[PDB]
Amino acid sequence: HTTDNSTAVQDSNGESWNTGLSINKGESAYINANVR
Amino acid sequence: HTTDNSTAVQDSNGESWNTGLSINKGESAYINANVR
Secondary structure, eight states, X not given: OOOOOOOOOOOOOOOOOOXXXXXXXXXXXXOOOOOO | OOOOOOOOOXXXXXXXXXXXXXXXXXXXXXXXXOOO
């Protein structure tokens, strides 16, 4: 008969990054005209 | 014939931070003119 006790203190840290891009296919750009 | 029972109690906690920044390419800024 074996008696065992286990303790552990796990410490972690981290970071993350994200980049996004959303486009509308109905009105995708606006045009400006220079006229005389 | 070996018989063992393993019982473990795990307690954990954490925290997080976040920072964001969104921009519209069509209208990235507004301008104002001081005229006379």
